[PDB]
Every structure is written in structure tokens, then in C-alpha cells.
Ligand binder design. Sequence first.
Ligand SMILES: [N]C(=O)C1=[C][N+]([C]2O[C]([C]OP(=O)([O-])OP([O])(=O)O[C][C]3O[C](N4[C]=NC5=C4N=[C]N=C5[N])[C]([O])[C]3[O])[C]([O])[C]2[O])=[C][C]=C1N1=[C]C(I)=[C][N]1
Ligand SMILES: NC(=O)c1ccc[n+]([C@@H]2O[C@H](COP(=O)([O-])OP(=O)(O)OC[C@H]3O[C@@H](n4cnc5c(N)ncnc54)[C@H](O)[C@@H]3O)[C@@H](O)[C@H]2O)c1
Ligand SMILES: [Cl-]
Ligand SMILES: [Zn+2]
Ligand SMILES: [Zn+2]
Ligand SMILES: [Zn+2]
Ligand SMILES: [Zn+2]
Lengths: 374, 374
Amino acid sequence: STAGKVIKCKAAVLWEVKKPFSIEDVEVAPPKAYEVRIKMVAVGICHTDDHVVSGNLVTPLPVILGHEAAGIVESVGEGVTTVKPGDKVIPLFTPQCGKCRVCKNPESNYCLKNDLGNPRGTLQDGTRRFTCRGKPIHHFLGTSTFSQYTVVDENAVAKIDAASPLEKVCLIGCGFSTGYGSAVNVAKVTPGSTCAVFGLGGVGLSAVMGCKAAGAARIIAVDINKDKFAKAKELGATECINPQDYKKPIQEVLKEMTDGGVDFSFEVIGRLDTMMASLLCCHEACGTSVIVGVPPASQNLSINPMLLLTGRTWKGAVYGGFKSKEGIPKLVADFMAKKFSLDALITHVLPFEKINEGFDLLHSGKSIRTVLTF
Amino acid sequence: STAGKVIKCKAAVLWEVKKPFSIEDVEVAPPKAYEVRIKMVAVGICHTDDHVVSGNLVTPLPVILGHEAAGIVESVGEGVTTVKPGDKVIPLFTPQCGKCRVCKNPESNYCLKNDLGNPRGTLQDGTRRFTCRGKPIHHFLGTSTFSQYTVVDENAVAKIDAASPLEKVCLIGCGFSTGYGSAVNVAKVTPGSTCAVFGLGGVGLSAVMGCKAAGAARIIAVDINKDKFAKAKELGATECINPQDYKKPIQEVLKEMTDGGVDFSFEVIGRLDTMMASLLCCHEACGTSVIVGVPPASQNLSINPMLLLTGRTWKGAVYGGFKSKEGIPKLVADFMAKKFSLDALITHVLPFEKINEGFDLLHSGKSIRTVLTF
Ligand SMILES: [N]C(=O)C1=[C][N+]([C]2O[C]([C]OP(=O)([O-])OP([O])(=O)O[C][C]3O[C](N4[C]=NC5=C4N=[C]N=C5[N])[C]([O])[C]3[O])[C]([O])[C]2[O])=[C][C]=C1N1=[C]C(I)=[C][N]1
Ligand SMILES: NC(=O)c1ccc[n+]([C@@H]2O[C@H](COP(=O)([O-])OP(=O)(O)OC[C@H]3O[C@@H](n4cnc5c(N)ncnc54)[C@H](O)[C@@H]3O)[C@@H](O)[C@H]2O)c1
Ligand SMILES: [Cl-]
Ligand SMILES: [Zn+2]
Ligand SMILES: [Zn+2]
Ligand SMILES: [Zn+2]
Ligand SMILES: [Zn+2]
């Protein structure tokens, strides 16, 4: 095996913002106690990965990005009980340490041992495991799955069904769980209700799916890129509207179209103007607006506090409200049991080496999710 | 007798903003079909009334203010089937019109016939029922209880228990129902949780009581007026914090005091800095922040949407989430069932003619609720 030995493999390093990925040869040190070394089989490109490339999300450079993924355990460190080598696993962008405030709370999932809050770029011990040209490389959200091998803490890796199609199931690691849990667990969309979803990406369309499973009688899907509408209708939307077709602001069009406004609105893009439209379009006495998109670093919204006073609920969440180590394995089992399908979401599969192309298909709005294979 | 004809009474007419109320002789027209003329027995001075006097809440002038009240049914107009003459009744500042969207929705309470959204200052039909000096006077929130007689719509009136201490129970017409319902029905406080309450006025203290009736294990009362703390301790707060004692910002004080922040925050004052400090003092990953105070006109908060993505909820509510025509009767009956006391909150009683003196006691911070009798 390679167990106990520093592996040398290919990985894509981002040496600085707004520039392409460099496929480098890196050394991945052995897992320490309670750490798992994972062999990557497939990874998806989530838009949060792009946010670090543009400068919208801040984290220390150079770094190896990636978090929506699935692979097999090469070795485990001492103490690792939940997984044996050879296990199929999905690494988690937010852990479930089980012992913290947020973790013993039945309704919360943003565990304290995360690296989104104040990004260190290391693993939980404050150390890094990758070296490229003798220089130490930074981790991203403790996962850094854009490498042929990665080391993640044990509380951040989930063991899934041994019959899992890892070329599909990786989307449950970030995209699908987030969009579907936003509807089903964060907003708790009622049967017979009316929802509006802004942005029809891999995380957006999963929310349209989540609302139809909850029983929403109407799912108006909003996107400026009209080519996404056909997939949206197939997956559940009843109406698809495009902002640029009207001379009057989208929240108004939506109130008039729905006798005051929808009951649940979902923002799954990341811009401030659409976060405002999403609050503004749900009914002032009975709407719940949910923020799923990651906003630009340090930008601020200006809301009139009176908008919330008549009865609105505004909130957001990470991972579609899912506690990660427990939630991702059960969703993989529902996949196994054919309760939902991920096929319409994966529009492209490219080899790892073609990663910079993957990021270009997201910039041209030609893809929903591109899967890089190793 | 009076039934069917213009009564002449004394009323507190606000003619100009930030000017004294005048006690005038006004003519109260008879109730049209589905209206009720009530003889006032006692009223509470709520801080919202003072927002109209200050010019913080715009409404058409001249107007007779007042909305926290209790009285006796004098003549009911034709078609009225819920109340008969002589019955004890409490006016409602938010109606329960039975058939509108919000009314038909089990979770919401801000019914469409309210006059807060865009005030007309009339009853639910575009007409006013008071005249004074040859001029018509506007109604406020369709109740206008600072008059010896007032005509209200039928769906904005609830029948309460016959033996009700009208000079106590009138609190349930805003102050008590708001604070208590805000914790019990809007936040939905949990057994064992930690709550924080900004503002210890009649509404705030009914919220301190609400957290205690929900089983909040720790309740932290916040106020710049240190004389409110004994009442607050008495009614349920485990600690009282005075912002001016610290060299540190108050949310920081509270987060350090609760291992991350409180579970539920309630802002019951109407100021943008406290409104901000309440969202910030709740835990980023699981706290719910509820706006109960009424904000000044056209004032805006800046908010980094990232504050909500980690898992915070922000919502507001009018009336404590109570569907008015029904909630208020039931609460009166729980009061009658000897399940709570309103005495602690009442700190002064004055004859109606003393109205301006009563607004002054609010302003001097010596009072909580002050009742004016007829
Ligand atoms: N929270 C959480 O968890 C999350 C979040 N996230 C987010 O989301 C968003 C989005 O993503 P995606 O889906 O992946 O991507 P895409 O594909 O790109 O999509 C987008 C869309 O949108 C649209 N638009 C734009 N613009 C516009 C629109 N629409 C309308 N309007 C306008 N203006 C386009 O076209 C498309 O379609 C982002 O932000 C992200 O970030 C995700 C995930 C999740 N995570 C978290 C983490 I820390 C990581 N991950
Ligand atoms: N949601 C609604 O249905 C509803 C209903 C009634 C009242 N209200 C609003 O609730 C708010 C309070 O109502 P009230 O009638 O109980 O008024 P109140 O005057 O008796 O209470 C205000 C309290 O806030 C305290 N306070 C003021 N500035 C403070 C500061 N910077 N920090 C801490 N404490 C401060 C004051 O000392 C006072 O104790 C008002 O805005 C009123 O308009 C809303
Ligand atoms: Cl008139
Ligand atoms: Zn992601
Ligand atoms: Zn934890
Ligand atoms: Zn109604
Ligand atoms: Zn009031």
C-alpha cells in the first residue's frame, strides 16, 4: 500500500486569485491520529469554489480547493473508528464533531470545528498536509478534494453504501443536500404552498426538486439565463420567469402574479440585489425568505426593519440544514432506493486535468454540474 | 335613547404633531351595519400612540388615538351577530376579518383590513364617524379609544368574560398580548433555553413573563433605566444588564455571558441600534431574533447577509402572533382562570381628562402601564 508513506500525486493549486489552476505534483503526508487519507474518484465544481478564485470569499493562498466529492479510503490514522480502508466515503465541508453546543442541538448544523467562520486554511490541529515545491499548501474547508489524495479529519468524512455510484453520489456532498435541504429542512415548505427559487444552478434546481417533494403547489423559477428553464420545468417548476423580460422590478411582478407574494422564497445565486428581491417577493404577513447563496465578501444590504414587523421570516443556512455525518449517509440510501435521481443535474463529466475547462463551462452557463473524474 | 343618534362626548384630539392633546366635545355618529359603538371604561397608554405624537409614525391628522382598551357595548349596528348591548368587549388594533388569505392561513395574523399598511384613518369602508367643530376627525388603527365613545367594525371587536376587571384586563388589548405572544407564539421559546429582552416597558415585561411561561431557563433583561430591574426580576428575569455600565458593546457582553450568544433575543423598544444588537447577541448558528418594537419612519439598518447564512433567524410580528378576534377572548379567560396577574405592570391610573400628564409619566420613565378611566 502507501500506508505510512508520503504520497506524491497530482492536485490543482491556485497560487493566487483571478488566475488559472496549475496541475501540480504535491506530497500528501500520512494521516495523523483521527485523520483519514482518501483516494478521489469524482468531484463536482460548486460555485463556492469559484468565489475563492474571483476574490468574493476570502481564504489563505496558495490553496487546493474542492468540497463536493466522493472517493475511497486509502488509509486511516490511529483512533479512527468510523471507517476502515477500502470504504467508500463522502468528505464534508462542515463537520459533525458530536460534542459541541451546535452539535448537541437537534436543530442546528453549523458545527464549531469549521473553517468558514474565520479561515485558517489548515486542518483541525492547525497543521497542513500538502507540500508543493517544498512550500506548505493550504487546505479549504478542511476537505481540499481537488487532489488525487486528501487528508480530512474523521468527523468530516461520511461512510456511504458500498454499492454507491461515486460518479453521481458526489453531488450529495454539497449541491443536492444543500438545495434540497433548504426547501425540506430550513424553510419546511408546506403542501399546497407557493415558492419562488432565484437561480437555477446545481444548488438552485435541487431546491425546485425539494419544494415539489414537500408538495408546493407552485414553483415559479427565476433565472436570467433562459437555457436553464427546460430542465427546471422537468424537475418541478410550474412557471419559469426571466427578469430581463419586464419593464417593472421582479418582486412586483411576482406579488401581482401571486396575490401578494409567494410563501417561501429561496435566493440561490449570491448577489445582494437578488437577496433583496427574494425578501421583497414573499408575502409580508406569512412569507419565509431563505438565503442559500454566499454573498460577496464584506458587502452590506440596507433593509427597512418594518418589512419584518408584519410577520416575515428571513434566515439562511449552510448544507441545507443537514447535520453532516448523519444526514449525508441517509440521503445516499434514499438515492439507492430510487427516491430521487441526480441524472438531470450532471450535464458534463471531464477528467481532473480538464478542471480549468470545467470552471469555464460554469462561466458560460452551459453546465448545471460538471464532474471531474480521476 | 342614544341608540340611533349622534352622541356628544369629550375626546382627546391630536390636532398637530408634537403638540398637546386637546379635550374637545365631539359628535360620534351611530354605528352603520356591522359596526359597534362602545362606551369606554378604561384605556392603556401604549408607546405606539406616542410615535404618532412624535411624528415617528405617520397617520392622517387630526385624529383621536388609542387602541389599548376595554368597554361596554352600547348600540350594535344592523347585521351584528357577535355582540349584543351591555356585553364587555375589547377593541382590536388588527382585525380578524375571517375570509382573507392571511385569516385563512393558520400561521399568519396581519389581516388585510388593518389600517397600518397605508393609513386612511377611517373605518373599513372609507368613512369616518367623528366630527368636532364642524370638521371630521380621523380614526387611528380603526379603534380610536381616547374618546368616551367610539364606533369600531365588528371583526375588530372581541367579546370577553362578563366578570372581567375592565380596568385590568384591557392590557390584553396590546401590551400583554404583544410581549407574551411574541415569546410564546412568534419566537416559540423552548424549555431550557436562554433568552435576552431589550426594553422593560409594559410590552417588554409581558415578554419576560412569556419566556418564563415557555420554560426559558435563563432570562436576561436589558435597559438603560435601572429602576425597571426589580419588576423584571419579580416577573421572571434571572439577570438584568444596564448597557451604560460597560466599556464593551452590549452584544459582546451577552455573547461572552452565554458561550456564544442567547437562543432567543427580543427587541421591545423601536430603535435601530438595539435592533442591531439583538440580532448580533443571538448565537450565529442557532439563535432566533424577534423584533417587537416599532421602528421610526424610513430608517434603515445595514446588514451583512453572512450573519444569516450561518443559521440565524430574524422575524417580526404584530399582536404577538394572536389572531385577534379569538386570541384576546381566550387570554382574558386564562386571566379569569387565575393564571396570571397584570398588577405589576400597572403603575398609575388617572381620569381620562389627565391624558397629557399620563404621556409625561411615560416620558419620565417612572411608569410602566398607566390606565385612564372613564
Ligand atoms: N449555503 C450553502 O450551503 C451553499 C451555497 N452555495 C451557493 O449557491 C450559489 C449558487 O451555486 P451553484 O448552484 O453551485 O452555482 P451556479 O450554477 O452558477 O448557479 C447560479 C445561477 O444563478 C443564475 N443567475 C446569476 N445571476 C442571476 C441569476 N439568476 C437570476 N438573476 C441574476 N441576476 C445563473 O444564471 C446561474 O443559473 C453560489 O453562491 C454558491 O456559493 C453553494 C453551496 C452551498 N456551499 C456552502 C459552502 I461554505 C460551500 N458550498
Ligand atoms: N409589535 C407590536 O405589536 C407592538 C405593540 C405594542 C408596542 N409596540 C412597540 O414596542 C415598543 C415598546 O413598547 P412599550 O409600550 O412597552 O414602551 P415603553 O416606553 O414603556 O418601553 C421602552 C423601554 O425601553 C427602554 N429603553 C429605551 N432606550 C433604550 C436603550 N437604548 N437601551 C435599552 N433600553 C432602552 C426604556 O427605558 C423603556 O423601559 C415601542 O416601539 C412600541 O411602539 C409594538
Ligand atoms: Cl367621512
Ligand atoms: Zn458547495
Ligand atoms: Zn460540533
Ligand atoms: Zn382577514
Ligand atoms: Zn399597542
